[PDB]
Symmetry: C3
């Protein structure tokens, strides 16, 4: 999982990639892990719930509908995720506490930073197929991320034998 997205894409042409239109807010720019999808819209109740779970080196892919109106994740939630073992969080939307996010040694990608907090109701769906920028994000897939963007693979890269 330490190969580059560019090199692995070359080996796995069928693997779906996403351009780096996200800003790297976290301490780690390169990260990877089994994906877990979440779809919401200006409400992060489910985001907090899911990250409180055990990370186990997985990557949370949040699809906030690309909205920049509210932040789906902040410093507090970022630190929790890190203490829970998550490799990283990818947000198709906004986040906040830019200064605090940079301190957390995990992957944190988002379209932009935005002031307001999201609502805390709980609308949204977990572990469901996603569609971000014309690409399918499927539960159980392995996400790879670096400076050149993201790569979703059906199985972690190998090389052992």
């Amino acid at each position: 999982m330490e190969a580059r997205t560019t090199d692995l894409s070359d080996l796995y042409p069928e693997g779906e990639a996403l351009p780096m239109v996200f800003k790297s807010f976290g301490g780690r720019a390169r990260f990877a892990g089994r994906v877990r999808t979440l779809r919401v819209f200006e409400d992060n109740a489910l985001v907090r719930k899911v990250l409180e779970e055990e990370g186990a080196g997985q990557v949370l892919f949040v699809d906030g509908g690309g909205s920049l109106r509210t932040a789906l994740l902040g410093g507090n939630l970022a630190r929790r995720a890190w203490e829970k073992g998550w490799a990283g969080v990818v947000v198709h939307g906004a986040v906040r506490d830019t200064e605090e996010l940079r301190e957390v040694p995990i992957g944190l990608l988002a379209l932009a930073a935005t002031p307001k907090k999201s609502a805390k109701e709980g609308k949204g769906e977990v572990d469901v197929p996603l569609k971000v920028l014309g690409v399918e994000v499927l539960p159980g897939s392995f996400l790879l991320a670096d400076e050149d963007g993201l790569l979703l693979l059906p199985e972690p890269p190998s090389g052992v034998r």
Copy 2:
């Protein structure tokens, strides 16, 4: 560190907010002040006239229709705004002389830098309600700007705790 867009957003749910989708070109990443508005399109004679007015504790929000064709503010106006005391300028549009803007100790946000200068016929409106990226910006509101974005309050923070 001091006031923040985020904290104050929590304390003031009625405030309007804009994501940090502007590039920071000024010497100050963080600034705030009483809002002064302006609407123009590829013409900045009004920008020069208004920034010449005393801007102590104020923030000029320039709605350029989002155009990136011409610059509404260059090195000269940036320095002028500073000499006149402006706390900052927010441009929904473009600016130029980025190397010079960076050296002026005022806040300066814009969508992008561009080479061409703006016309100077003087078309535009002063201190009128603006609608930027879905958010209404009003002359007389208080603006806060930092790395997390822009917060617009109907008036500055009211001491209902000890200050904010």
Copy 3:
């Protein structure tokens, strides 16, 4: 690297200019050169064929239609262009190997990085007028690029062409 896009824009009002909406991936954000154009869609065989020629202080302007699905340029080709003397490559589309690109001392502007390499079927148009962000880019023109944006002139400034 020399003459500023802002100063020359003032001097040559008729010239065409583009805002700095590109990310500077190369080791030099300032560069200039005679323009060579190319319009392709997620295919980079022609881009490779072109940059494999003597660069001689020219700038290649690739119009990938703005797509960010595949990279029109990688590290090997970027370094190749550099060794061929190309002054820089402007890509209205995406590139990859950003880590390697930062190490290539020529202009390398693009909208974004993306993992997928492009197809190599070789389709596209070489040295034809281009239409990037409402501005026309003509092959033969002289391009200047810096932090303030891109300026296209009919001939190099009153300097000595090649680099400004």
